[PDB]
Amino acid sequence: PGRGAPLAVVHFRDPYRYKIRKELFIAPEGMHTGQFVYCGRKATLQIGNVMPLSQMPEGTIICNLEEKTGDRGRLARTSGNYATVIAHNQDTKKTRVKLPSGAKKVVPSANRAMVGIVAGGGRIDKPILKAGRAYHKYKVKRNSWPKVRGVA
Amino acid sequence: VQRLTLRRRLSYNTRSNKRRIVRTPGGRLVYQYVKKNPTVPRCGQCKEKLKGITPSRPSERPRMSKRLKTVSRTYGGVLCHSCLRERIVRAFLIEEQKIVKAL
């Protein structure tokens, strides 16, 4: 609720303990229930595997990108948004990505991202039409109001 | 008609004063309190109700028999009979692919 992209509940096994881990992800478009997700260094390039940004070709469209390595998914994770692997710089190990702002940032190349655009795009083309339908939008987010103007 | 009054001090209409009109041997029209609807368990992945199990309620199941809560087979009150054989053949054709991929 509030977040316009769907989430996905993925069940990994624990490699050291004897239980089942239950991970929330942010859905790549085309992800469906019952499919396999591979996360790791030796992930094949298919949606929605998540693998380090060095094992990708250039121009690969990615989502759920780690800003710093290991920090579990901080970039391009709204609805309909993605990053693009522009070009590696093979040693010095710094991929450059293009981010949904237009802005073009340099990451490292050991951090991970999941392949694919994110699901739920593109929400923002429907008109709201209705003050009461923006009420409903925002009552699961916060008190950004009916924003009365300061000039009033 | 004989109008009714509530016999508990909860005067509001929530989900825990569910009541029915009763006629008693004095010709009375009194209220009887209904407890909550018993339900059966679901399959572990269908989210469809199971059969062979009586509809129970979480406090009643200590005071129920064993065979009133089970079916009789493997994964009995846990999975459908169809989701069960969907696993028996999957736990076999995968563990027979893992011999022809080993030789």
Binding site: G4, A5, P6, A8, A27, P28, E29, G30, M31, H32, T33, G34, T44, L45, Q46, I47, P57, G59, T60, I61, S79, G80, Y82, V115, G116, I117, A119, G120, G121, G122, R123, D125, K126, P127, L129, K130 | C46
Partner: protein, 91 residues
């Protein structure tokens, strides 16, 4: 018979909101509420639960889709592009 000449599904907002935003939302208001053919078992039963998530009434597969359309064209051009990079980088 045919009940409306031109509005179709947006006669429910009737005389509300201006003709362009009714015209604009109607494209999305049809594809959402449509039944797409299920790409897992074949039936015209792939309807939308919430924004971005589509599910099939038989076969019980929920997918992650677009806000109104089941599969966007901006995402099938990614599923193509990824497997033509997968063809080069694997073998």
């Amino acid at each position: 018979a045919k009940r409306t000449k031109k509005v179709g599904i947006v006669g429910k907002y009737g005389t509300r909101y201006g003709a362009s935003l009714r015209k604009m939302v109607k494209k999305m208001e049809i594809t959402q509420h449509s039944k797409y053919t299920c790409s897992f078992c074949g039936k015209d039963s792939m309807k939308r639960a919430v924004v971005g998530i589509w599910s099939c009434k038989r076969c019980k597969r929920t997918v992650a889709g677009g806000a109104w359309v089941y599969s966007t064209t901006a995402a099938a051009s990614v599923r193509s592009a990824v497997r033509r990079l997968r063809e080069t980088k694997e073998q």
